[PDB]
Amino acid sequence: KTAHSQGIEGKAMSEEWARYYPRQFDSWKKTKESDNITDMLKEKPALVVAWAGYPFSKDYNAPRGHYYALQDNINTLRTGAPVDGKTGPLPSACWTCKSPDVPRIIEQDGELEYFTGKWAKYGDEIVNTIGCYNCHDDKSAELKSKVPYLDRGLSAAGFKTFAESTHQEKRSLVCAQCHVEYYFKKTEWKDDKGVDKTAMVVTLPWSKGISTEQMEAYYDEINFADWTHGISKTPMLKAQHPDWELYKTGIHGQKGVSCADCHMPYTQEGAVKYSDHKVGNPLDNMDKSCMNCHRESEQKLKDIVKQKFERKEFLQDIAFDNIGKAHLETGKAMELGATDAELKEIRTHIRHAQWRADMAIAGHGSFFHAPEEVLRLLASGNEEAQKARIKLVKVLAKYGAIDYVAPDFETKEKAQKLAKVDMEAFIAEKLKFKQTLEQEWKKQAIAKGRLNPESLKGVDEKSSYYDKTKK
Amino acid sequence: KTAHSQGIEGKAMSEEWARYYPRQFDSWKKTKESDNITDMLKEKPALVVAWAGYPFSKDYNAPRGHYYALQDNINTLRTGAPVDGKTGPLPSACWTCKSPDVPRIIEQDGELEYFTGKWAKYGDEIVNTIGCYNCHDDKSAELKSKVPYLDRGLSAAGFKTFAESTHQEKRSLVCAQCHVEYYFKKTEWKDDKGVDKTAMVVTLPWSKGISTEQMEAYYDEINFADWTHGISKTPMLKAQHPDWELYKTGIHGQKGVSCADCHMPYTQEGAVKYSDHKVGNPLDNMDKSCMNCHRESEQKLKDIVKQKFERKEFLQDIAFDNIGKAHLETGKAMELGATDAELKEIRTHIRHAQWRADMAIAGHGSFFHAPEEVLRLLASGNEEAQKARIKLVKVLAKYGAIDYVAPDFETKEKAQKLAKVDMEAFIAEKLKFKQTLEQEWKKQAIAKGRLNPESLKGVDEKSSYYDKTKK
Ligand code: HEM
Ligand code: HEM
Ligand code: HEM
Ligand code: HEM
Ligand code: HEM
Ligand code: HEM
Ligand code: HEM
Ligand code: HEM
Ligand code: HEM
Ligand code: HEM
Ligand SMILES: O=S([O-])[O-]
Ligand SMILES: O=S([O-])[O-]
Ligand SMILES: [Ca+2]
Ligand SMILES: [Ca+2]
Ligand SMILES: [Y+2]
Ligand SMILES: [Y+2]
Ligand SMILES: [Y+2]
Ligand SMILES: [Y+2]
Numbered sequence: 001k002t003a004h005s006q007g008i009e010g011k012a013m014s015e016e017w018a019r020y021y022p023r024q025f026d027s028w029k030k031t032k033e034s035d036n037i038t039d040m041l042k043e044k045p046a047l048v049v050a051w052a053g054y055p056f057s058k059d060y061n062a063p064r065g066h067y068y069a070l071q072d073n074i075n076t077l078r079t080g081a082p083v084d085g086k087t088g089p090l091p092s093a094c095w096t097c098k099s100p101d102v103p104r105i106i107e108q109d110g111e112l113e114y115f116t117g118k119w120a121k122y123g124d125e126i127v128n129t130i131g132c133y134n135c136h137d138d139k140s141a142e143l144k145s146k147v148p149y150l151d152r153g154l155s156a157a158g159f160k161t162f163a164e165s166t167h168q169e170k171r172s173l174v175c176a177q178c179h180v181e182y183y184f185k186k187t188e189w190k191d192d193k194g195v196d197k198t199a200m201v202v203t204l205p206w207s208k209g210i211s212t213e214q215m216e217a218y219y220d221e222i223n224f225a226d227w228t229h230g231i232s233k234t235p236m237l238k239a240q241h242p243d244w245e246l247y248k249t250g251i252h253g254q255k256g257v258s259c260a261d262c263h264m265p266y267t268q269e270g271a272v273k274y275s276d277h278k279v280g281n282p283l284d285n286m287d288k289s290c291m292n293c294h295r296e297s298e299q300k301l302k303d304i305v306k307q308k309f310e311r312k313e314f315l316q317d318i319a320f321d322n323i324g325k326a327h328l329e330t331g332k333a334m335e336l337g338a339t340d341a342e343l344k345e346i347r348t349h350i351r352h353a354q355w356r357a358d359m360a361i362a363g364h365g366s367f368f369h370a371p372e373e374v375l376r377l378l379a380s381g382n383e384e385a386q387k388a389r390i391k392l393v394k395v396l397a398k399y400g401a402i403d404y405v406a407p408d409f410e411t412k413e414k415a416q417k418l419a420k421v422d423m424e425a426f427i428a429e430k431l432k433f434k435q436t437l438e439q440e441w442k443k444q445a446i447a448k449g450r451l452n453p454e455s456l457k458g459v460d461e462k463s464s465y466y467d468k469t470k471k
Numbered sequence: 472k473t474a475h476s477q478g479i480e481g482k483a484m485s486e487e488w489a490r491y492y493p494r495q496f497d498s499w500k501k502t503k504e505s506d507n508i509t510d511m512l513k514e515k516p517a518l519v520v521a522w523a524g525y526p527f528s529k530d531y532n533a534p535r536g537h538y539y540a541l542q543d544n545i546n547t548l549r550t551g552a553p554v555d556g557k558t559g560p561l562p563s564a565c566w567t568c569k570s571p572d573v574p575r576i577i578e579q580d581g582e583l584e585y586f587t588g589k590w591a592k593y594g595d596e597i598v599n600t601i602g603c604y605n606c607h608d609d610k611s612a613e614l615k616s617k618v619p620y621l622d623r624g625l626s627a628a629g630f631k632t633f634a635e636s637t638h639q640e641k642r643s644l645v646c647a648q649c650h651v652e653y654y655f656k657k658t659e660w661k662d663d664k665g666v667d668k669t670a671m672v673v674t675l676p677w678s679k680g681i682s683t684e685q686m687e688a689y690y691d692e693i694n695f696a697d698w699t700h701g702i703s704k705t706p707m708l709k710a711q712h713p714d715w716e717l718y719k720t721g722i723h724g725q726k727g728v729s730c731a732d733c734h735m736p737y738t739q740e741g742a743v744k745y746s747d748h749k750v751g752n753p754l755d756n757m758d759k760s761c762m763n764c765h766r767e768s769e770q771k772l773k774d775i776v777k778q779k780f781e782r783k784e785f786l787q788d789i790a791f792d793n794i795g796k797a798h799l800e801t802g803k804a805m806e807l808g809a810t811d812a813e814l815k816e817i818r819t820h821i822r823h824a825q826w827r828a829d830m831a832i833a834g835h836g837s838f839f840h841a842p843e844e845v846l847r848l849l850a851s852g853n854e855e856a857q858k859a860r861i862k863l864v865k866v867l868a869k870y871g872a873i874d875y876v877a878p879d880f881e882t883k884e885k886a887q888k889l890a891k892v893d894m895e896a897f898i899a900e901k902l903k904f905k906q907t908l909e910q911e912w913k914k915q916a917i918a919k920g921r922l923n924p925e926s927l928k929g930v931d932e933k934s935s936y937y938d939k940t941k942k
């Protein structure tokens with residue numbers, strides 16, 4: 001039993017847990033150190049063509065420290081510029097994996113109500129970032145999954161629920177509350193007062209299993225599309241950080257090595273063992289993260305990972321180049337008057353190509369977590385994309401355009417022009433929101449006592465569209 | 472110093488070494504146990520289209536035990552049906568990696584003379600299979616490379632020579648005398664008696680380095696082709712078992728684990744350590760071959776290898792399907808009258824596609840030795856093949872044939888018809904050779920005392936074209 005056996009008042013605010021766990025609080029806060037913004041649309045402008053007609057063609061950066069998750073949610077152009085709790089492009093579900101205020105609100109209002117409405121609905125309530133309460137019971141301090149969709153997905157794919165799993169299983173599943181692929185399943189429901197509502201509910205596409213191909217069958221069976229492509233009008237699927245599913249999968253996952261083993265390694269101090277809560281890049285910390293199970297140099301091992309990264313880049317760039325070309329060639333065929341029936345098989349190829357390639361690259365550690373599956377997926381994706389292009393040559397031929405050359409998209413600017421993204425307009429609208437409604441959120445939350453301004457230190461210094469310089 | 476410090480009379484005949492090393496002799500002979508013939512043209516008839524116009528479109532089986540190497544050389548349809556020492560399709564170099572009689576003849580007649588003439592030249596001389604004298608000095612019993620091309624290649628690629636290497640390096644290099652990619656470099660020379668000769672000399676394509684792409688540049692720079700494709704008339708490159716180069720490469724090679732560690736593991740008996748000379752499949756022997764360095768089950772580890780194999784199959788089948796189609800589409804474009812200039816870029820793509828995919832699959836353990844490089848290569852190959860096909864669609868369009876569908880090649884029979892291989896004729900001609908000149912070889916060698924008929928026990932019971940049933 002703990003020094004807080006009856007619970008913690010203000011549990012959602014990680015700082016409340018500091019009185020019991022100063023060591024874990026101090027390392028947890030250090031993810032403030034991972035403050036770099038890598039604009040992935042800038043590195044990989046092919047992704048803009050890929051995501052044409054979708055919010056990720058606006059703004060898409062690489063992950064940084066958990067210290068930034070809530071602010072990044074607010075900052076991304078993907079969440080747009082709500083003017084109140086009923087406006088803005090995105091639903092309430094976008095909060096789900098960013099805040100210990102999520103379980104707080106779910107446990108107070110119910111899952112369906114939580115998943116009902118606009119992201120802006122909870123702006124002055126969902127104010128704390130990735131916190132102790134996302135992973136830990138506030139009485140026992142035991143690892144807990146705080147989100148019901150995870151057990152739902154687990155069961156569906158035949159795994160044990162969180163409660164049913166081993167401790168070593170749990171040390172990965174806590175991560176898997178967030179670090180998995182999801183879709184929003186539009187859900188009709190009735191409240192306590194009898195009103196008709198519609199919830200958009202986080203759903204793990206795991207009921208045929210956790211492989212890319214099994215999820216592909218899942219989505220195909222239900223004829224699901226995340227968006228209709230802005231250039232090719234293909235019914236598209238978006239992969240988002242299938243980190244756990246692919247880790248599963250890979251030799252370390254197979255061997256039973258948990259996420260926490262590399263990302264939260266132990267420091268022994270006599271009778272007391274302590275987990276590093278500074279979740280970051282394990283290569284920054286190889287003695288503790290790797291060298292319990294690996295003999296031989298840090299350096300050789302860092303070089304082996306670099307080599308994996310470069311193999312992944314190689315196949316990634318190929319796949320997304322042919323994916324991009326295929327979308328563009330398809331838009332061209334459309335302009336020339338080619339029919340839906342004439343393009344249906346092409347579009348199915350593009351949908352599958354991109355599903356597989358996105359599933360490979362959407363988890364930023366997968367190139368390491370499951371290198372062979374990653375390469376196999378990117379190679380499989382590219383093959384679908386190439387089959388699309390061979391068929392496209394013929395369709396273009398049929399309409400007099402066999403010599404058509406898809407435009408280039410080697411810069412983010414050129415790519416966003418093709419995708420018809422008025423980023424400037426979006427940034428302007430965004431800043432206005434940050435300057436007005438965002439500050440009203442943070443002011444109100446601080447007044448209500450839901451937010452401690454200590455947690456805002458350097459959290460809002462950078463985004464893909466500004467950089468004050470300091471974070 | 473050894474019990475044979477002055478050398479061994481009849482060193483080429485491994486049985487001569489038995490008086491000193493009964494334990495190693497007994498396990499060495501046990502590779503007679505690996506007697507299965509897997510006709511790879513039957514499993515993978517796409518390889519017939521790939522090798523159209525080349526001997527491997529006749530006969531190509533998977534490796535079996537070293538006990539069979541010399542007889543398989545004699546049996547393969549690739550060596551055809553010489554009627555004497557000046558006939559038959561293939562040169563003397565085909566003996567090089569099959570027999571301890573090779574170093575014997577090189578050391579007696581010189582490298583250039585050895586490499587001068589037809590394979591049939593040495594039929595009654597090269598009569599012992601893979602023997603102690605291929606790897607061991609007959610005075611010290613120390614590991615030795617017996618072939619000068621290996622050090623030549625080693626130096627060229629910047630590695631230490633055999634003599635310069637560590638013992639653990641040597642325990643892989645002994646294998647690398649044979650288990651590497653090679654080409655025959657036509658070489659003009661003058662003998663002792665002043666006559667003009669031409670040697671076809673085994674050359675490691677390693678002077679730009681040992682990567683697939685480095686060898687590709689090697690061959691491109693010299694405008695080298697192994698054959699001109701029988702269907703597409705592409706200048707082709709043949710990969711042959713780049714086992715060492717790819718192992719190099721892979722995590723085990725990187726970590727310094729030698730071929731001998733898995734393939735020739737140790738048995739400790741007090742003061743005495745003994746290497747298993749039965750070179751075979753290490754999964755048959757996992758306690759000794761794997762479980763010194765791996766904790767956890769044999770079974771999980773066997774399952775992990777199976778999974779690698781199936782990923783390799785998946786990308787292999789894709790690549791060789793598009794390679795096959797590309798050759799066929801190219802032959803079709805030729806029939807319609809397309810020009811060399813119109814096909815040059817296509818052909819370059821096909822040459823590179825197949826070079827890379829063949830380099831991936833030509834070493835039968837590479838899917839395990841270097842799984843990530845294997846997948847990356849097959850994915851790279853397929854991409855070249857797909858680029859070829861997109862360009863081909865246009866060339867076919869230009870000649871009225873945009874709707875052309877390449878024939879299928881899903882059986883060896885169908886594939887050999889397309890490749891114009893009269894296998895029946897070849898088999899008939901072969902049997903005649905085995906029934907006459909082959910038996911004269913073996914009779915004469917046994918008379919001269921170069922061959923002990925004990926070594927022929929069950930060695931000639933099977934091939935791709937007969938099976939007496941017993942081996
Ligand atoms: C111990 C289990 C977890 C592991 C191993 C893990 C791993 C990581 C890593 C390595 C990063 C990037 C950090 C960096 O750039 O150095 C990251 C970022 C992120 N993680 Fe986790 N994580 C875990 C738990 C969670 C949970 C439970 C959630 C959801 C509540 C979550 C949501 C996020 C988000 C939203 C980001 C991006 C943050 C940003 O860019 O601002 N993670 N995680
Ligand atoms: C559409 C609603 C959502 C929005 C607008 C949103 C926003 C973001 C942003 C801005 C990032 C930082 C990197 C980037 O710029 O992309 C991020 C990363 C992340 N998000 Fe979300 N999020 C949404 C839904 C979700 C959900 C439902 C989950 C969990 C089931 C989740 C989990 C994560 C995780 C684990 C990362 C870090 C790993 C990575 O980025 O690859 N997010 N999200
Ligand atoms: C400041 C907030 C946090 C506090 C006060 C806290 C507290 C603790 C404590 C007391 C332990 C046990 C001792 C130890 O291993 O150090 C622990 C371990 C652990 N925590 Fe946290 N934690 C926090 C944040 C988080 C979050 C957000 C996650 C999930 C993403 C998480 C996941 C884990 C994991 C996986 C272990 C390993 C436990 C084991 O080995 O069984 N922690 N934490
Ligand atoms: C399912 C459990 C795991 C999760 C959720 C997880 C999460 C992640 C994330 C989000 C990243 C991207 C970091 C970034 O670029 O922002 C990453 C990378 C990485 N992870 Fe994991 N990881 C898990 C398991 C593991 C394990 C078991 C290991 C070691 C065996 C490991 C080691 C690494 C390494 C070496 C990288 C690349 C370095 C980096 O980019 O940070 N991870 N992981
Ligand atoms: C970020 C730190 C780590 C790095 C960079 C790393 C690196 C590697 C690499 C490159 C492999 C080869 C597998 C492949 O091709 O993907 C491997 C295998 C393996 N690693 Fe890790 N690893 C790390 C952490 C760990 C930890 C914490 C454990 C133990 C709990 C572990 C145990 C293993 C095991 C058991 C294998 C399978 C090979 C074997 O049986 O020894 N690793 N690791
Ligand atoms: C210790 C170093 C070596 C290793 C690890 C090795 C490995 C192997 C393996 C695993 C096989 C297939 C056996 C089976 O089917 O179970 C094989 C076959 C073969 N090896 Fe080696 N080998 C080595 C040395 C050599 C040498 C020095 C030569 C050349 C003189 C050679 C030439 C061959 C040939 C020609 C075959 C195919 C034989 C046939 O199908 O009849 N190997 N080797
Ligand atoms: C063109 C001349 C040659 C011929 C006719 C020939 C014949 C054969 C045959 C019949 C096999 C058994 C498997 C099969 O049916 O393909 C084989 C395998 C093998 N040969 Fe050759 N050989 C030649 C040149 C070479 C050379 C020069 C080397 C060494 C530098 C070599 C090394 C090997 C090795 C290591 C294998 C077993 C590995 C594998 O087959 O993938 N061979 N060869
Ligand atoms: C019947 C013929 C052979 C005999 C009598 C023989 C003899 C021996 C002896 C006495 C040893 C040292 C003790 C031991 O480790 O068992 C040895 C080891 C070894 N032999 Fe052989 N050998 C034969 C065939 C071969 C062949 C054809 C190869 C090459 C393909 C080969 C490669 C090796 C290797 C790699 C070792 C390991 C030595 C070490 O660990 O340093 N042997 N052999
Ligand atoms: C360059 C050194 C090596 C050579 C020349 C070599 C040779 C080969 C050959 C020719 C095969 C194909 C067997 C067949 O299907 O006929 C093979 C497969 C295999 N080798 Fe190696 N090998 C080497 C290194 C290693 C090492 C270091 C390991 C273990 C770490 C290993 C383990 C295996 C395994 C598990 C297979 C697949 C099982 C099989 O098909 O026999 N090899 N090797
Ligand atoms: C045929 C028997 C063996 C099998 C089936 C096997 C299997 C594996 C596998 C699957 C990996 C993961 C790397 C990958 O993805 O390719 C690995 C890594 C590794 N193996 Fe092996 N292996 C064998 C023999 C050996 C031996 C004899 C040694 C030691 C001399 C060894 C030492 C290692 C090392 C050092 C790693 C790197 C991961 C680590 O650092 O632990 N293996 N092995
Ligand atoms: O948008 S979040 O799922 O990465
Ligand atoms: O023909 S031999 O090089 O496998
Ligand atoms: Ca999704
Ligand atoms: Ca070659
Ligand atoms: Y308190
Ligand atoms: Y990062
Ligand atoms: Y004797
Ligand atoms: Y075999």
Ligand SMILES: [Y+2]
Nearest residue numbers: 371372842843
């Ligand atoms: Y691997």
